[PDB]
Design a protein around this ligand. Structure first.
Ligand SMILES: Oc1cc(Cl)ccc1Oc1ccc(Cl)cc1Cl
Ligand SMILES: Oc1cc(Cl)ccc1Oc1ccc(Cl)cc1Cl
Lengths: 213, 209
């Protein structure tokens, strides 16, 4: 087990388990290296430092999800509101059923344990901005198709949706007995969309088909 | 009582800059200007100290929430809405209280440390119960929409408040406590409350008492 034989995915899988178990602060390069079956030099073979490791764990789940959201605004389909619902609701289900995904999402939610460091906060800012941009674009396509209520601002709508969804994610992390990621994510999403979306455009409470492709 | 208050203040300054993990009772003492003996008299450990910090803020907030369901006034939605709007305003205008609140909202680093998640859980449960009591009184008074379930309305209100607070801690310039907090509150209340019950978009008068 020479350090240079470690693969990037094995380094990231090991680091994500370290971070889930010990948190960001207590995780060290030596711990990540040992966990993957090597020593710290196997981590250096891929990443300058622990924050690059964190960024890469985040990117690996945030990238795919941003891709899904981006598809909801396509001019090749004429149901952007339904598509946004398909993406979000299946994401909620996935987060609820896949502990590994859920624990990475919870690493980001938890953020920096003190004002001393802003390392997770900047990644969160950049992620929030990415998600908002994409939701706002889907909502702008919905307006053109006459699917929004008169006067609905798609930028405000996107901001309200992120707020009530973010709140469900934080609540479920704190007290899963009281706040249910699937059930309440879907209620927050539908409630928020119904404030900005015309009646009759989608049926609240329904499970959409996974977005095609 | 007042030495208590001094430790707590200093502990606020440490907890916010340094975090829950790296702060100890000895660091808190020094900034506070007191002896280790003096400090231990009040709090034998960091968690006892955090519990009294959260308490200081969380308690009187729960007392404001609790009042909105009083069987003595007939405007529970208006009152609950007023409490949250005023709270949002106060947080936005008082950096002291806003730092104490972020200490209160930040998560434990791991799934292994908890005692701060334990007060979050208890705090989360207290706030939801009180929201639900005010919305059930609204329901009794004919102020909720047909078929609105006060338990469900309170969960959505709670998620709404929590998403605004968290949104603003990450991106103050993208999530404005006062302006987006009021928009989000009014949106979620209008999903469950009949029209004409409160006046949206405005800051209500101070509640009595
Ligand atoms: O996009 C992300 C950004 C960060 Cl900073 C951390 C995790 C991420 O991944 C997700 C976030 C929210 C939802 Cl609802 C679903 C997924 Cl997969
Ligand atoms: O802001 C968001 C709003 C919505 Cl409705 C969906 C996903 C969002 O994106 C995130 C949610 C949580 C974390 Cl930790 C990171 C990111 Cl990017």
């Amino acid at each position: 087990k020479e350090d240079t034989q470690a693969t990037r995915e094995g380094i990231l899988d090991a680091a994500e388990a370290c971070f889930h178990e010990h948190g960001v602060a207590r995780t060290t390069l030596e711990m990540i290296g040992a966990r993957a079956g090597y020593t710290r030099g196997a981590v250096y073979w891929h990443f300058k430092n622990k924050s690059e490791v964190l960024a890469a764990i985040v990117e690996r789940v945030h990238l795919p999800f941003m891709q899904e959201l981006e598809r909801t605004s396509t001019d090749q389909r004429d149901t952007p509101v339904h598509d946004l619902r398909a993406v979000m609701i299946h994401s909620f289900i996935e987060l609820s059923e896949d502990e590994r995904l859920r624990k990475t999402m919870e690493i980001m939610l938890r953020s920096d344990a003190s004002a001393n460091t802003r390392v997770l906060t900047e990644m969160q800012q950049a992620g929030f901005r990415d998600a908002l941009d994409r939701m706002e674009r889907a909502l702008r396509r919905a307006r053109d198709l006459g699917q929004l209520r008169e006067g609905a601002d798609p930028k405000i709508a996107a901001r309200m949706l992120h707020a009530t969804v973010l709140g469900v994610l934080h609540g479920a992390m704190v007290e899963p007995e009281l706040m249910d990621l699937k059930r309440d994510g879907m209620l927050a999403l539908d409630m928020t969309l119904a404030a900005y979306v015309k009646d009759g455009v989608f049926v609240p409470g329904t499970v959409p088909e996974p977005l095609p492709e």
